[PDB]
């Protein structure tokens, strides 16, 4: 089976001319298009008769009604937006199809040549009479008789060019996706072109080509492999240093993933923590709330003010308060609203139920409640626009270290592991205070085997400090999978390289090691102060970037990630969507959880200010 | 600037009409490509006659020397490689290239729009005159006088087309790659192609092109990225299962990662034991080769023969043999001649230096020799078939609670680990065996050292909890019941645990069915673990006690495991690449090998 396509321009003995590409077997199917000037139609009929006598094969005569002749760009484009759709219904296929660029204009064989090597095809053909035919015998066939001469005396010259096996995104595009408008003007098929669909679809899909074949050999730097579809000037965007105050749309709809977040910590001042208040279940057992000043400057102080005095920034809030289940409901219900306003696609809530626990409310109840929160929020939310939450135990601070306190928290969390299996999920516990040398033994006092033995994960708190030894003991002791706070690792060069190898993910928390022990911003060049994040990168070492507390440190996700250029000098923007990645990486999630948290990722927005 | 191309043929009026494109600015340098056809020359005198007495940008007159009229495709085949390679002289730039292709047949305009849509170009426009001169005012302006009105009297409109972005890998050729002989026969330059390189060289990037198109959705699935350049046939011939006859010399050729060898194992018997003892410095001293017999069927015994056979099969080597200085060079040496003639691109050794250990050589010493008779082999390698080979050193548990020998091999290896930096490294040690809970093994850790684990005969579940906790152990050897304990299947999974799978070893000492219609209670893991996420890897163990080498292991898992796909036997080479305990330097080199994947050879 094989259909025949050409172009009729003012001479139509082309068209009876191809008919012998194959010798006496022909086509299967021929089709002719052509154009609406006055000086085609004169010519159709000579094919109407023609195609009248030696009706061996099915005919088909169109010509397009919107390109008269070629005056401006818009006709040739006019009638090249025609020919493909009128190339797919003719032409289903691509194997079968057969083509002659003898007839028409010279962008209109052009037409037809490219036409073909992009849905693919069999052949590409032309036809050239000898003039020894007329009067006079100067001139090529132009009369039934004269055609039917050079046919029968073998006076055409066929100079096949060759097939095309056509692009992969391409041999898909059926007729039927772009419908094409047919009159029947009697045995003459014209057609028109309804939408520029066609043509916006085949830019759209050579154009996408162009842009991943440009990007095959960074492809293993990219940390997203979408990013290949990207064009070549934004993949150097890409490449170049992050702008804390250009870069803040473009920081703020990245889907992000969240580590590192107390649930205590969320609304401790302002619209919020009135908020929270609000919604108490009683307003009457209520403390009164304090005046707790923040320091000068804040969110980015003119000097640290110390861990211990961090932590007092959040006394309106925390274990006082959230006792009440209604205000404990705001809590997991206005957090979960921040998480959706800075497009956090998974995140890991780290709450101390023990702490919430009343003379009628045990932490198992606490507990319960917390996890149905999010949970119920979570199903209110579309599966595209969702936030996925998981939730961390945490062994707390100096408040901890009772025998009968840390092996509590750690029995609610082997209960709860085995409990849920879908949705909001205990993934995992927090050794907090693992910073406090008396804490410490408490720490290692308490058998962690049986949290080992369940498929918890644990993930160990090393706040303000300069005890290397106790990352050590984290690593080999407690088989901690994250470290939080690790902000002394290049000091010691061998633990450094332990955290690459073993793949020990580090939670860095900008804003709150900014405030609690401070650092150079916007420093020219990188110095021994600096902030270790293009350190940790250098060495391989799997870096996060996280929030720490919402409402203490008074930043969003957005905000930590935008510090980083302020706080590293020269981070690019390729180094915080590669921290996204080892967060996705470092995460306590099932295979369930990763693989529907790898298509939020690979969903990286597009820059806006690509110009320079 | 701002080059022009033009085409020329029975019409030369074209060139002094396409050079009016720009209007008065016009071109820099405006060359022209013709035909070596008599009937185009009139045109050619006429269009010098219009360069001359029109002076400015450079003037060129090029005719194809071996095309002279359309009369097979075989001319259209020597046009576009002189046009193409015409135009990679001419006009170098793409933004610079300015391309009309009125001038010509009518398949010449189709090469010049055709060529401009694949390398590129500024501007491939189409000049047309109205039909408004001649002796009778219908013909088009043909004069030298007539040319000059048609020009000044506005009688040009140009169909302009828009320029051209080409591809990415073709908008880089230059002219010196494909150069052209340009015969100076007066103002003109007849030039001619001499070779096709640039008809193949471009032909060949399309076909590249497509299948990584085709296959770029289809990634993430693949271990290596660099699959996707082949060819949708190839690229579904490797997720058909695995066949142990017919893909002998694939998985031969394909560059192989060893994580689990033992070096006293290697030449146990037949030529490769005696080519050992024929290099004995001390051949008074040499112990007599003991008579060993091999359980019928070897490699494939009939019924598995424990691991305490297993063991006395390679009496003749090792400890026996290796504590003369000659002998251990030949193992050495015949040991890494053995992964070369395997493709292997990195290899660890595991070793006793204390096993070797004479009253004049200390463990220190024999483990100096060790690493440079791999250093010295490496070294005298190409770089480019170069297998890297680190070193393991066991601590094996012994049978009469003699711990000193765990002592003095935990701290060669400390030892060992700061002294070399390059090269032959001390990557690890391997306890392969509760007094290694009470043993310390922090020292190890605290230097950097990884540690490997042999899961024991016993299906001691509580063994491998141990090793992964309490040992802190980065892969495990022959952890064959990981099944057995869903929970722990799933944190082996989790923390990137890596499981070292011998098939021979494993078939030889616990036995396992072979050619098993369908998957059964009691077959080898290796798919139950890949299934799990878990990270999976071949060894050979012992290449001379099991007689075979990690080729023939990756064949035998399409009996061990049926139904295995040939892309699970490529994931196994990208687990063991990234279980390995090599530094980035290492690791960077390894990819690069990796990444060559041999092509099927039937496919079909
Ligand atoms: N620095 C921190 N370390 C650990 N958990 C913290 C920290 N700050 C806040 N939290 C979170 O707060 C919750 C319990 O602590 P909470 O905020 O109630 O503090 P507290 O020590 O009980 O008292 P206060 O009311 O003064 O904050 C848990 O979610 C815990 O994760
Ligand atoms: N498949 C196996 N399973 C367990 N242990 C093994 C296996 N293969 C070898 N071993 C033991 O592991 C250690 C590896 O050391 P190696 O084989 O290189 O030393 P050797 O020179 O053969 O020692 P020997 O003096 O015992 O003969 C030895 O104890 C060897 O017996
Ligand atoms: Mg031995
Ligand atoms: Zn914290
Ligand atoms: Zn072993």
């Given at each position: 089976?094989?259909?025949?396509?050409?172009?009729?321009?003012?001479?139509?003995?082309?068209?009876?001319?191809?008919?012998?590409?194959?010798?006496?077997?022909?086509?299967?199917?021929?089709?002719?298009?052509?154009?609406?000037?006055?000086?085609?139609?004169?010519?159709?009929?000579?094919?109407?008769?023609?195609?009248?006598?030696?009706?061996?094969?099915?005919?088909?005569?169109?010509?397009?009604?919107?390109?008269?002749?070629?005056?401006?760009?818009?006709?040739?484009?006019?009638?090249?937006?025609?020919?493909?759709?009128?190339?797919?219904?003719?032409?289903?296929?691509?194997?079968?199809?057969?083509?002659?660029?003898?007839?028409?204009?010279?962008?209109?064989?052009?037409?037809?040549?490219?036409?073909?090597?992009?849905?693919?095809?069999?052949?590409?053909?032309?036809?050239?009479?000898?003039?020894?035919?007329?009067?006079?015998?100067?001139?090529?066939?132009?009369?039934?008789?004269?055609?039917?001469?050079?046919?029968?005396?073998?006076?055409?010259?066929?100079?096949?060019?060759?097939?095309?096996?056509?692009?992969?995104?391409?041999?898909?595009?059926?007729?039927?996706?772009?419908?094409?408008?047919?009159?029947?003007?009697?045995?003459?098929?014209?057609?028109?072109?309804?939408?520029?669909?066609?043509?916006?679809?085949?830019?759209?899909?050579?154009?996408?080509?162009?842009?991943?074949?440009?990007?095959?050999?960074?492809?293993?730097?990219?940390?997203?492999?979408?990013?290949?579809?990207?064009?070549?000037?934004?993949?150097?965007?890409?490449?170049?240093?992050?702008?804390?105050?250009?870069?803040?749309?473009?920081?703020?709809?990245?889907?992000?993933?969240?580590?590192?977040?107390?649930?205590?910590?969320?609304?401790?001042?302002?619209?919020?923590?009135?908020?929270?208040?609000?919604?108490?279940?009683?307003?009457?057992?209520?403390?009164?709330?304090?005046?707790?000043?923040?320091?000068?400057?804040?969110?980015?102080?003119?000097?640290?003010?110390?861990?211990?005095?961090?932590?007092?920034?959040?006394?309106?809030?925390?274990?006082?308060?959230?006792?009440?289940?209604?205000?404990?409901?705001?809590?997991?219900?206005?957090?979960?609203?921040?998480?959706?306003?800075?497009?956090?696609?998974?995140?890991?809530?780290?709450?101390?139920?023990?702490?919430?626990?009343?003379?009628?409310?045990?932490?198992?109840?606490?507990?319960?409640?917390?996890?149905?929160?999010?949970?119920?929020?979570?199903?209110?939310?579309?599966?595209?626009?969702?936030?996925?939450?998981?939730?961390?135990?945490?062994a707390?601070?100096?408040?901890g270290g009772d025998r009968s306190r840390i092996a509590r928290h750690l029995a609610?969390?082997?209960?709860?592991?085995?409990?849920?299996?879908?949705?909001?999920?205990?993934?995992?516990?927090?050794?907090?205070?693992?910073?406090?040398?008396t804490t410490?033994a408490a720490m290692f006092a308490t058998d962690?085997?049986?949290?080992?033995?369940?498929?918890?994960?644990?993930?160990?708190?090393?706040?303000?400090?300069?005890?290397?030894?106790?990352?050590?003991?984290?690593?080999?002791?407690?088989?901690?999978?994250?470290?939080?706070?690790?902000?002394?690792?290049?000091?010691?060069?061998?633990?450094?390289?332990?955290?690459?190898?073993?793949?020990?993910?580090?939670?860095?928390?900008?804003?709150?090691?900014?405030?609690?022990?401070?650092?150079?911003?916007?420093?020219?060049?990188?110095?021994?102060?600096?902030?270790?994040?293009?350190?940790?990168?250098?060495?391989?070492?799997?870096?996060?970037?996280?929030?720490?507390?919402?409402?203490?440190?008074?930043?969003?996700?957005?905000?930590?990630?935008?510090?980083?250029?302020?706080?590293?000098?020269?981070?690019?923007?390729?180094?915080?969507?590669?921290?996204?990645?080892?967060?996705?990486?470092?995460?306590?999630?099932?295979?369930?959880?990763?693989?529907?948290?790898?298509?939020?990722?690979?969903?990286?927005?597009?820059?806006?200010?690509?110009?320079?």
């Amino acid at each position: 089976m094989r259909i025949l396509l050409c172009s009729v321009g003012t001479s139509w003995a082309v068209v009876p001319e191809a008919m012998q590409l194959l010798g006496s077997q022909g086509f299967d199917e021929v089709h002719v298009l052509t154009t609406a000037s006055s000086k085609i139609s004169p010519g159709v009929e000579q094919l109407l008769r023609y195609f009248e006598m030696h009706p061996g094969p099915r005919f088909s005569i169109s010509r397009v009604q919107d390109f008269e002749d070629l005056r401006s760009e818009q006709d040739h484009m006019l009638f090249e937006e025609v020919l493909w759709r009128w190339l797919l219904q003719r032409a289903p296929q691509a194997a079968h199809r057969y083509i002659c660029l003898a007839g028409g204009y010279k962008t209109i064989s052009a037409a037809m040549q490219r036409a073909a090597a992009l849905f693919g095809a069999c052949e590409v053909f032309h036809v050239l009479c000898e003039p020894r035919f007329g009067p006079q015998g100067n001139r090529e066939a132009s009369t039934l008789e004269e055609v039917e001469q050079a046919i029968a005396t073998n006076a055409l010259r066929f100079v096949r060019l060759g097939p095309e096996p056509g692009w992969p995104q391409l041999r898909l595009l059926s007729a039927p996706s772009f419908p094409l408008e047919s009159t029947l003007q009697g045995p003459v098929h014209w057609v028109r072109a309804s939408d520029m669909r066609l043509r916006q679809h085949v830019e759209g899909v050579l154009e996408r080509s162009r842009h991943i074949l440009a990007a095959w050999e960074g492809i293993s730097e990219l940390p997203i492999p979408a990013l290949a579809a990207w064009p070549p000037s934004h993949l150097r965007w890409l490449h170049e240093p992050l702008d804390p105050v250009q870069d803040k749309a473009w920081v703020q709809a990245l889907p992000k993933v969240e580590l590192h977040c107390h649930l205590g910590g969320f609304a401790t001042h302002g619209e919020l923590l009135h908020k929270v208040r609000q919604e108490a279940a009683n307003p009457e057992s209520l403390p009164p709330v304090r005046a707790i000043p923040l320091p000068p400057g804040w969110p980015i102080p003119e000097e640290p003010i110390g861990l211990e005095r961090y932590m007092r920034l959040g006394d309106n809030n925390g274990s006082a308060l959230l006792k009440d289940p209604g205000c404990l409901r705001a809590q997991c219900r206005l957090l979960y609203e921040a998480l959706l306003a800075d497009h956090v696609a998974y995140a890991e809530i780290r709450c101390s139920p023990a702490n919430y626990a009343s003379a009628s409310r045990s932490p198992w109840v606490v507990l319960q409640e917390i996890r149905n929160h999010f949970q119920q929020a979570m199903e209110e939310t579309p599966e595209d626009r969702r936030c996925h939450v998981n939730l961390l135990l945490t062994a707390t601070r100096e408040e901890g270290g009772d025998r009968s306190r840390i092996a509590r928290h750690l029995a609610l969390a082997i209960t709860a592991a085995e409990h849920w299996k879908n949705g909001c999920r205990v993934v995992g516990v927090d050794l907090a205070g693992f910073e406090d040398r008396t804490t410490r033994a408490a720490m290692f006092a308490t058998d962690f085997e049986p949290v080992h033995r369940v498929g918890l994960a644990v993930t160990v708190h090393a706040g303000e400090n300069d005890d290397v030894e106790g990352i050590w003991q984290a690593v080999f002791k407690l088989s901690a999978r994250r470290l939080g706070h690790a902000l002394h690792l290049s000091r010691s060069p061998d633990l450094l390289r332990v955290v690459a190898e073993r793949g020990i993910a580090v939670e860095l928390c900008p804003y709150a090691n900014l405030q609690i022990k401070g650092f150079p911003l916007d420093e020219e060049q990188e110095g021994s102060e600096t902030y270790p994040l293009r350190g940790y990168l250098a060495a391989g070492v799997a870096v996060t970037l996280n929030t720490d507390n919402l409402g203490i440190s008074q930043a969003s996700l957005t905000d930590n990630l935008l510090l980083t250029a302020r706080l590293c000098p020269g981070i690019t923007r390729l180094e915080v969507l590669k921290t996204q990645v080892f967060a996705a990486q470092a995460a306590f999630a099932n295979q369930a959880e990763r693989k529907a948290l790898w298509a939020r990722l690979a969903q990286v927005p597009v820059p806006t200010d690509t110009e320079q």
